[PDB]
Amino acid sequence: STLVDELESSFEACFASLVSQDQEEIRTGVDQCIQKFLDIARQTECFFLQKRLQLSVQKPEQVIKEDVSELRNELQRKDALVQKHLTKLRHWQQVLEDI
Amino acid sequence: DPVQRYKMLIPQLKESLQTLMKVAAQNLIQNTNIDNGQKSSDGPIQRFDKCLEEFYALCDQLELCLRLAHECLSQSCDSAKHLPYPQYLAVIKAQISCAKDIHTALLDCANKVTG
Amino acid sequence: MCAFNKVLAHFVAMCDTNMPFVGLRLELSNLEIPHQGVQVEGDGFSHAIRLLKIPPCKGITEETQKALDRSLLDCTFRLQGRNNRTWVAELVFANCPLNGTSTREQGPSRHVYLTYENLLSEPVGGRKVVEMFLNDWNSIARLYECVLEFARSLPDIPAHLNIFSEVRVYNYRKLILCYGTTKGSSISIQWNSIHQKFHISLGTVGPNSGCSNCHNTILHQLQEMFNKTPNVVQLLQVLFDTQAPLNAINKLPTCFSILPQSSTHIRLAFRNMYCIDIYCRSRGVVAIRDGAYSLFDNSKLVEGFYPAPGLKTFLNMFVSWAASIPTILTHSALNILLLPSPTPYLCSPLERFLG
Amino acid sequence: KNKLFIKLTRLPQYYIVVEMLEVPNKPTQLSYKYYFMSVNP
Amino acid sequence: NTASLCRIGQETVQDIVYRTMEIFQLLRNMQLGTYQDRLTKLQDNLRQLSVLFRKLRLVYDKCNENDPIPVEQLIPYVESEERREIAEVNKKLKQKNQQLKQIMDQLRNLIWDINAMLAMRN
Amino acid sequence: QYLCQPLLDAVLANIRSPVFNHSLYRTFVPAMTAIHGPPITSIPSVLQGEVARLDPKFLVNLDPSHCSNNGTVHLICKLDDKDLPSVPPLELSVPADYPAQSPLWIDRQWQYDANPFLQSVHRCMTSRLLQLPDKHSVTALLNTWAQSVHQACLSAA
Amino acid sequence: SGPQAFDKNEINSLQSSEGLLEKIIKQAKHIFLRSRAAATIDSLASRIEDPQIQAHWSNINDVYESSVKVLITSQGYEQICKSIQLQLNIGVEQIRVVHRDGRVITLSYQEQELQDFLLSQMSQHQVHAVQQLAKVMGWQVLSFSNHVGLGPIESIGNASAITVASPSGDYAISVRNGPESGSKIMVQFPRNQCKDLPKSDVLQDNKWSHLRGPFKEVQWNKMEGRNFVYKMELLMSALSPCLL
Amino acid sequence: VSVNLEAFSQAISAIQALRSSVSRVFDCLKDGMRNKETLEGREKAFIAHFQDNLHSVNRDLNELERLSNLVGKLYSQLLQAYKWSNKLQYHAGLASGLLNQQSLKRSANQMLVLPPQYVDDVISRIDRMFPEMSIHLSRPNGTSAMLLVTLGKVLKVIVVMRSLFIDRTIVKGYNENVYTEDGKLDIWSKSNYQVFQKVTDHATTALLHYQLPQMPDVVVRSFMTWLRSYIKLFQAPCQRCGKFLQDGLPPTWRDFRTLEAFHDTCR
Ligand SMILES: [Zn+2]
């Protein structure tokens, strides 16, 4: 129940051999803990993707809003890059003028 | 010493195996000669059970010696892995405290996740 | 621009993806595994070899072969990976006998993906690939026998085991039981056809146990007891008995040396002079003894152990040569006799006695 | 005598042989013939 | 909004696994002042990971609050002002990308000319 | 062999005595039980597998006619594919003990007459049947049938 | 050359007066060829937006050599799909391509060759992305063929194909991407889930309604996503047990 | 030394195997002949099991003897911390390997500048190991460091970096003049032989293959580790065809992650 909590429990189970009071015991325990951990991680990602798919088919204006936001960040990032580059160009023109 | 004790214990082990197999065969042949209709001398039949436990005692001595030597050599390997005697005690309490710190960091935060 | 010659590129690609299956068809036919031929599979852009009947097996009952061959549906071989020399066989079984606490509790068709890669010598469809496949199928059969017995015995189980252990994983190649009151420890049983044994492997998976499995001291004798009689309920009984003694014994210092004899016959040795036998038994009872004495000629002593004087009286508190006869306990008196209490340095009671 | 032997390297003992022939009427076109040889001196 | 919350929730699970991998690497390297520095890095990583778990439970509850259409009805088998906003920003960064391409081409050509002219002087 | 031979000689000397396991018990169980403690605490399904995995071109069904629920079984297939033309249904006689042997194609020469195209289908199909390896499946027959129909489409045009 | 004995080649290399015209024409040839290669790469980056394509020209040139590094990654998955990277060594009249997986191909000075080459590499990227994505989402890669040999003949280069299976069995996804006729992608359902499947009287058990017999085809436009691998990830998540 | 550790653990398991096999002999003899339908079949089964058990005892005794031939020779808090440290180190090694094999990171995005002194420290650190490789850094053109890695009497590799990340490599033979007329590095040349042009191509795939995104020290160290394996050119045979020569070429392909020789035609 509530895949978050299974993720938390499995993550705490990854450390159970260290926090208490040779090789093959460690190996099989590590393999089983890490495999259950990654399996519940993939199930959580699958849940988020299914919910995003249902939103993208039912309420498509939200997707367009996120695209608007990402294109605006692309614009601002491009202008920041060109401004830094332009300041470096003007500094190099002032350097190369002085030979 | 443990290598030399091991060399001591090997031919005793082969001797105990020889006596155990031969005495098993003698006791089985005597019991089949009573069970089937056969004459057989009573004689110095030399019981089987003592030979079996003697073999087990020799294997206990061998596994004891080898577990001791393996613990000693693994001990020396990790001891070399990690000159005034107070400097020794200072770095030893340093190492113990540092490992305690790693352990309590892991325990406190793996409990801080849930419960 | 007609300078590509598309037909030759198509013929070269067609030969290089099809001709690996021809050697596999020949090596399947030499071992007389009935198969439908190399067929285009579903969509047009693939290839497959579907088996029909994998040759029975060697050394399992006919109930198990009738239960296997009515549970198989399909065993396709497909070719994948770069260089096109990685086969993957997709077995799919119906009517799985037991589910897991891992969420394979879905529709009763389990898929087992075996994968084989021959070396760069001994070409892509060879004797080695089909030999590895028959060994893997043999492994699945020789564990399916035990799983059939266990799933038969599952409704009528002694009902303290039913609280003790639940099944985590059944892949048809492994069986991972997870036992403990908190379900923190785990055994994993798997047939290994190199040695032709079973392999029991122990691990700690779960956030309440010691730093080890605590059955790892008796693992060799566990594997041997399982190979002599492969019964899962026997294995659960042995774990259920010897867990509470061994969890105490592993907390002893090391002075104390632990020689397990045969399983449920742990034998402790203090330094070198003193010995004490321990027999785990049924219903939370452990019988201890003197070790150094004989089980036969009472006058004689064992080769390396000197008898402990006064041992019997000390054990009696928890409950001449009369240390040689055993003295049963509760596992709780064993906890008290072995877990280090301060003194009436944190030593044990027992090591105080022998000291 | 105008042929091309294309050995497959993932599986040797297999050759694709391209034979190029002149189409009789068209002097600026070729005709290809693809054979499949196998090989064991 | 919520269809970006799903993206953040995916990114949290992607970060948790990567962060556990970095934790296990830190525990791999720790050899019994840099002792204390590795202690600080370990404790800070564990703090950030607990923050990530709390954030993940928040995002899970938010997306699970806000379904009438079951999946596998959503896949196509064979047999309004925000759109204008999209077209506006698309035309805007079309022009921005073409100007960036001109800047990039002139920088490339200047670098190539510098390297050729300096290569021939020897 | 070495270090174990006299046991082997004793036991191989004393096989076929009815009191043998009595002798082994009397000579071995008290030692072991002292040391080790007391002892322990209609249609054959191969064809269903073939038919369940066929391509949706084929439409294999049982013949209403012929003996049923007995040794051999009999099939009337079909062919559906936009690329391929409609053809005579095809009749198959699968033996009991189906793997390790080859099924038989019930030949109907009279319906493969009365057209040139069905004649080409039939000639090409008998050719690929002669080309087949032994102990082939049902799906090998069905796929040679579909390839024969395709070659008889191409050879004609 | 006398005591440290030289061959013919070193002797002729010491004494080889190459005129000014050959040197200048080789430099101008390299300039023009390099400009054409940059133009074709930027035209593919402008026109095609489906995978992506990147370039990183080197710092240092000669008068007869330059170098790029061409990546082809999908848009939001630059950690997953890093399996197709190229290096082109633009000589005087040849472009020498070294792949990531040890394939060396020498093109010619025409700009149709480089265009068809990079088009085939985008087509193979659209399959290697799905393979390394099914690595992440736990799906099992049943079959993979880098240059498939069945089906229609593609004009530019060969076509690639995978088929992956859902981790709980039932569903399968087959991709076949080609450089001229791209992306015939189709799922495979279990039986007892098509329901237009014409049943047969030979199957008298219910165990055979669990094999995946039927095959339907996904219409790839109208699928939601602004990318290919994004659409594949949504398709893979749709064929999972609905966890909610 | 570790070989004594492995031999002692080996012989421990040998004693346990010997003891259990002897007890198995006597346990199977305790039960007696089973039934097994055919009388001939039951005799065969009993004889076979007894013989196998005896053979296993003999094998275990022989293995113990072979190990005997090969054997060589508050405080508890410190040992507990030592054991727990080795346990944590091995546990973390396994878990780190399993997790970085399967990462779920898809993109770096959510929602190069280095001192040349650092590059020299890194590359001198690599040059200290691998005693048969000598790396000689120079900077003829700016901050882009150029490296001559000589390798035995076999190779001379010219590596052209760009901000502590390998960019181009050229592999030439030992005698070949890697210097121009003026004694600078010949950054743009080829090597007159078929073999070393093949190894330049394989080295370019090697620098395209070993790509971590951020940390570049593992990249250069792994590239030099791979490059070190070429010292057995002209001596290693191909691991697919056995021979040394395919079309007059030695096996030029040292495979990544398992440095084995192949002719590139044998992939
Ligand atoms: Zn070779």
Give the distance from CA H239 to its chain's centroid. 16
Identify from F137, F141, F144, F150 which residue to disrupt to test chain C contact, counting C C-beta atoms within 10 A and taking the largest count.
F137
| E25: its two tokens | 């690497």
Q: Which residues of G touch F62 (CB under 8 A)?
A: 201-202
Q: Which residues of C touch D32 (CB under 8 A)?
A: 5, 7-8
Resolution in A: 3.5
Contact G222, G239 (CB under 8 A): no
d(CA C278, CA C284): 13
CA dist G141 → A56, G163, G165 (Å): 28, 6, 6
Amino acid letter, C161:
L
Using CB atoms, which residue from F49, F55, F136 is nearest to C73? F49
d(CA H68, CA H7): 9
Q: Determine whether the interchain pair G67/H168 forms a contact, defined as Cβ–Cβ distance below 8 Å.
A: yes
d(CA G173, CA G189): 9
Distance C15 CA to ligand 1 centre (A): 21
d(CA D22, CA G190): 53
Residue located via tokens 């076979």: H48
d(CA C25, CA C13): 20
Q: Which residues of G touch F74 (CB under 8 A)?
A: none
| Burial (CB count <10 Å: 0-12, 13-18, 19+), residue C333 | middle
Distance G159 CA to ligand 1 centre (A): 28
Give residue H172's region: left, alpha or beta (phi > 0; psi -120 to 50).
Answer: beta
Q: Which residues of H touch G92 (CB under 8 A)?
A: none
Question: If we measure between CA atoms, which residue out of C221, C348, C231, C228 comes closest to residue C280?
Answer: C221
| E14: its two tokens | 């992607």
Q: Determine whether the interchain pair H103/E17 forms a contact, defined as Cβ–Cβ distance below 8 Å.
A: yes
DSSP per-residue codes, F38-83: SS-----HHHHHHHHT--TT---EE-SSS--SSSSEEEE-----SS
Q: Which residues fall within 8 angstroms of residue H121, CB to CB, at 6 or more apart?
A: none
| F54: its two tokens | 């066929």
Q: Determine whether the interchain pair H29/F8 forms a contact, defined as Cβ–Cβ distance below 8 Å.
A: no
Helix and strand numbers, DSSP H then E, in chain A: 3, 0
Helical pair H2-31 and B2-35, crossing angle rounded to 10 deg:
10
d(CA E10, CA E60): 10
- Please name the residue of chain A whose CA is at the shortest distance from the CA of residue E65: A51
Q: At residue G86, what are phi and psi to the nearest 5 degrees?
A: -125, 165
Return the sign of the alpha-carbon dihedral for residues A45, A48, A51, A56.
negative
Q: Which residues fall within 8 angstroms of residue B36, CB to CB, at 6 or more apart?
A: F14, F17, F19
d(CA H234, CA H245): 10
**Angle at CA G220, nearest 5°, toward G217 and G222?**
120
Question: If we measure between CA atoms, which residue out of C71, C107, C64, C72 comes closest to residue C91?
Answer: C72
Q: Which residues of H touch E4 (CB under 8 A)?
A: 111
Question: Which chains reach chain G with 3 or more Cβ–Cβ distances below 8 angstroms?
Answer: A, C, E, F, H
Residue located via tokens 């037991």: C98
- Helix locations, chain C, DSSP H: 6-18, 20-30, 62-68, 127-153, 161-164, 219-228, 232-249, 311-318, 332-338, 349-354
d(CA F47, CA F44): 6
Half-sphere exposure of C129 (CA within 13 A, CB side): 30
Distance H240 CA to ligand 1 centre (A): 5
Distance in Å from the first CA to the final CA of chain D: 21
Residue located via tokens 């002949």: H33
Distance D13 CA to ligand 1 centre (A): 14
Question: If we measure between CA atoms, which residue out of E104, H52, F103 comes closest to residue A78?
Answer: E104
G60/chain E closest Cα distance in angstroms: 6
F17: three-class secondary structure by DSSP:
coil
Measured in residues, chain F has a length of: 157
Using CB atoms, which residue from H84, H98, H102 is nearest to A30? H98
Q: Which residues fall within 8 angstroms of residue F149, CB to CB, at 6 or more apart?
A: F79, F84, F85, F87, F121
F41/chain H closest Cα distance in angstroms: 16
B96/chain A closest Cα distance in angstroms: 15
| Burial (CB count <10 Å: 0-12, 13-18, 19+), residue H111 | exposed
Q: Which residues of G touch A52 (CB under 8 A)?
A: 234
H6/chain F closest Cα distance in angstroms: 28
Question: If we measure between CA atoms, which residue out of C239, C243, C200 comes closest to residue F41?
Answer: C239
Measured in residues, chain D has a length of: 41
Contact G96, G195 (CB under 8 A): no
Residue located via tokens 């030394």: H1
CA dist B86 → B94, B97, B99 (Å): 12, 16, 20
E33/chain G closest Cα distance in angstroms: 35
Do chains B and C have 3 or more beta-carbon pairs under 8 angstroms? yes
G191: three-class secondary structure by DSSP:
coil
Beta strands in G22-139, from DSSP E residues, in sequence order:
54-55, 66-67, 70-71, 85-90, 95-99, 104-107
| Burial (CB count <10 Å: 0-12, 13-18, 19+), residue H249 | middle
Q: CB of A7 within 8 Å of any CB in chain C?
A: no
Interstrand relation of H146-151 and H133-138 (parallel, antiparallel or unpaired): antiparallel
d(CA A8, CA A3): 9
User: Could you say which DSSP state residue C76 is in?
Assistant: E
User: Could you say which DSSP state residue H264 is in?
Assistant: G
Q: Determine whether the interchain pair B14/F3 forms a contact, defined as Cβ–Cβ distance below 8 Å.
A: yes
- Please name the residue of chain B whose CA is at the shortest distance from the CA of residue H73: B3
Q: Determine whether the interchain pair D16/C15 forms a contact, defined as Cβ–Cβ distance below 8 Å.
A: yes
Question: If we measure between CA atoms, which residue out of A16, C12, A78, E16 comes closest to residue G157?
Answer: C12
- Rg over CA atoms, chain D: 13
Please tell me the experimental approach by which this structure was elucidated: cryo-EM
Helical pair C6-18 and C20-30, crossing angle rounded to 10 deg:
20
Give the distance from CA F29 to its chain's centroid. 50
Distance C120 CA to ligand 1 centre (A): 9
Q: Determine whether the interchain pair C304/B71 forms a contact, defined as Cβ–Cβ distance below 8 Å.
A: no
Which strand (E) or helix (H) includes residue C258?
Answer: strand C256-260
Q: CB of C22 within 8 Å of any CB in chain G?
A: no
Q: Which residues of C touch F99 (CB under 8 A)?
A: 34, 52-53
Q: At residue C347, what are phi and psi to the nearest 5 degrees?
A: -100, 170
Distance D9 CA to ligand 1 centre (A): 10
Give the distance from CA H117 to its chain's centroid. 31
Give residue H257's region: left, alpha or beta (phi > 0; psi -120 to 50).
Answer: left
Q: Which residues of F touch G214 (CB under 8 A)?
A: 56
Distance D16 CA to ligand 1 centre (A): 20
d(CA H60, CA H24): 13
CA dist H129 → E93, H123, H134, H150, H215 (Å): 51, 10, 10, 14, 20
